[PDB]
Amino acid sequence: AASGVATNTPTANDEEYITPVTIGGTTLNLNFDTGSADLWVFSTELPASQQSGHSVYNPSATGKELSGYTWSISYGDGSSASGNVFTDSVTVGGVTAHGQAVQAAQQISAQFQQDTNNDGLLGLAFSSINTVQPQSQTTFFDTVKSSLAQPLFAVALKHQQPGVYDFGFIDSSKYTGSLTYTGVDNSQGFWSFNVDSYTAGSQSGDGFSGIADTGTTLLLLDDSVVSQYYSQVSGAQQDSNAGGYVFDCSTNLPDFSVSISGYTATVPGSLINYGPSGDGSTCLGGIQSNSGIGFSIFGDIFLKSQYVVFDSDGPQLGFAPQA
C-alpha cells in the first residue's frame, strides 16, 4: 500500500505553500489547493514571455493528448486560466499517479503571470468540481486513493518553516493529544464542515459552515464576524492598498477560536498578524471578509495552527493542535 510525504514551503509572509510535483520527468513547484479540483500547469503552449521565471511542462515530450478536451477557470478576483489536456505520470512525495489528467495552460491572466513562486496548482477538492470538458477528470488524490494504505491525506502548514503533506497515513508526531473528527458535506465539491460556535476575543456567537482551503492565504469570515473581531483591535482600519484591515504591528491581537464537534480549534493572536502590509508602518490582519459569499474560508491562517486529516471515508476531517 502506497504512502508518501511531500514537503511544502511557505513563500514570503506565508502567502502560499509550494510543493514539488514531477510530471513526465520534469519537476514543477505547485500550490496544493484543497479548494479546487484541477491540476493545471504553466506549459510550453504559453507565449515564451509568459513562460519566463517558471518551470514549464512540455506536453509533447511525454503526454498523451485528449483531443477536443478543454478546461477553464474564472475566479471572483478577476483572474482566469484555460487550456487543453494531456494524461501523464504525476509523482508527489514518491506516490505516482499513472494516466493523471494534466491541464496545460494556454492562457493565464496577469495575476498568475506576475506570481513566479509557483508553476500551477494541484487540486485536492472532490473530483465532482473538476472543470475539464466534455468529461471531467479525477484529481491526483482520487486517482491514487485506492492504492494508498488509507484513503486520506493530512497537512501541517507552518509559519515560515517547511511543512508536510502526508499521503495515505497519519503522522501522530505532528500533533498533540488525539484527533477530533467532524463530518464533511461534499455536495458542492469542498471539504465543507460545521462549527458549533466561535469566540472572537471577548465575543462569542453562533456557528456556521466553512471549507478547509489550503489555497487561500487568509481566514475569510462573514463581515459581522470581521467587525466584531476588529472592534477589539485598537487602531484597526481598512486599507485597500494593503488588502483589508491593518493595524500597528505591535498590536496585541485577540485569539480566534471555533468549536468543532466538541473540540476548540484556536488560532492565537500572534498567527493573526499576517505581516507587513507593504505600505507604511502597518501589518495586515489574517482575518478578512469573505465578501458575502455565504460560507467561511478556513485558509492558511487557520491551518497553521492545526494538523488536519482529509479522510475520504465519511468523508470526514480530523483536527488536533500542531505539535
Curated annotation (Swiss-Prot):
Subcellular localization, as worded in the UniProt entry: Secreted
UniProt xrefs under InterPro entries: Aspartic_peptidase_A1, Aspartic_peptidase_AS, Aspergillopepsin-like_cat_dom, PEPTIDASE_A1, Peptidase_aspartic_dom_sf
Gene Ontology cellular-component terms listed: extracellular region
Signal peptide coordinates: none
Glycosylated residue positions: S3, T7
GO biological process, one term: proteolysis
Free-text function comment from the UniProt entry: Secreted aspartic endopeptidase that allows assimilation of proteinaceous substrates. The scissile peptide bond is attacked by a nucleophilic water molecule activated by two aspartic residues in the active site. Shows a broad primary substrate specificity. Favors hydrophobic residues at the P1 and P1' positions, but can also activate trypsinogen and hydrolyze the B chain of insulin between positions 'Gly-20' and 'Glu-21'.
Summary of subunit composition and partner proteins: Monomer.
Protein name listed in UniProt: Penicillopepsin-1
Organism placement in taxonomy: Eukaryota, Fungi, Dikarya, Ascomycota, Pezizomycotina
